[PDB]
Specification:
Length: 267
């Protein structure tokens, strides 16, 4: 019952989303996931999973604050982050300075390392799922419910993304189990996007052409990064988008290089 909220508890981009303010805690974001008839037998599963992901407390990971389970409405509640996702921030009129970009990355590394410690594999890491608060600090999100079996099915019910960050072992092979190294690939392409200030592959249509190109070893154009980018970061993104997953490092491994690096070079 601890993660159960309801509409009467509440006063009242992104999508079909509404802002809200609960009594005790500060400001919150609410999204309605499903509208339709009551599945009922698939409710105990929804709450058990809602409390399982409520356990994920990290300053760089979005916390599920609660879930509204009413007659027809099924909704989720999360922490507020005012600057939006990382891309919208990167595409802004004012440029984000190097030192900020470095911290952002360190924050992404920490949050992914915490999730891998708890056993959660993100599956859909990208700039849309990196949320930014007022002081340019970040939290890792999952706006497409990729890590939440039951709630995603609830979203994709009868009665109710972008492949640029996906590891090539998952492209055209849907039956392969995502590993911790799958996120490491995605992280690499995020690193590109950060210093390129845009989505990769000229934001071109997700063709069979592009999929086979990536499976054969093509990557985002490093030459397209026109602003200054530290060599340590260029080395890391190339290391992390290696075709062979064994060649990619682990997020604990990444943090050990990068934390000492950020503090001296970038901060
Ligand atoms: C309101 N809202 C959400 O709460 C949101 N959501 C659920 C809870 C949650 C979230 N990320 N985490 C951290 C995390 C845990 C494991 C793996 C990866 C990350 C946790 Cl835990 C998260 O992004 C889902 O639905 C939305 C969709 C849209 C759109 N479109 C907007 C808002 C929400």
């Amino acid at each position: 019952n601890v993660i159960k909220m309801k509409s009467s508890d509440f006063l009242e981009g992104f999508g079909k989303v509404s802002l809200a303010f609960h009594r005790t805690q500060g400001l919150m974001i609410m999204k309605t996931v499903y509208k339709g008839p009551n599945c009922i037998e698939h409710n105990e599963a929804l709450l058990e999973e809602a409390k399982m992901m409520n356990r994920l407390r990290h300053s760089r990971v979005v916390k599920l604050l609660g879930v509204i389970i009413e007659e027809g409405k099924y909704s989720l509640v999360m922490e507020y982050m005012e600057k939006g996702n990382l891309m919208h921030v990167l595409k802004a009129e004012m440029s984000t300075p190097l030192s900020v970009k470095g911290r952002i990355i360190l924050e992404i590394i920490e949050g992914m390392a915490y999730l891998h410690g708890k056993g959660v594999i993100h599956k859909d890491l990208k700039p849309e799922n990196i949320l930014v608060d007022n002081d340019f600090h970040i939290k890792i999100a999952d706006l497409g419910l990729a890590s939440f079996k039951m709630w995603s099915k609830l979203n994709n019910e009868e009665h109710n993304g972008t492949l640029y960050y996906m590891a090539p072992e998952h492209l055209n092979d849907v039956n392969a189990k995502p590993t911790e190294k799958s996120d490491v690939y995605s992280f690499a392409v995020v690193l590109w996007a950060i210093f390129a200030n845009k989505e990769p592959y000229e934001n071109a249509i997700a063709e069979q052409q592009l999929i086979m190109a990536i499976k054969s070893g093509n990557r985002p154009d490093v030459d397209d990064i026109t602003e200054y980018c530290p060599r340590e970061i260029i080395s890391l993104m190339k290391l992390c988008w290696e075709a062979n997953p064994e060649a990619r490092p682990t997020f604990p491994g990444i943090e050990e290089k990068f934390r000492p690096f950020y503090l001296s070079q970038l901060e």
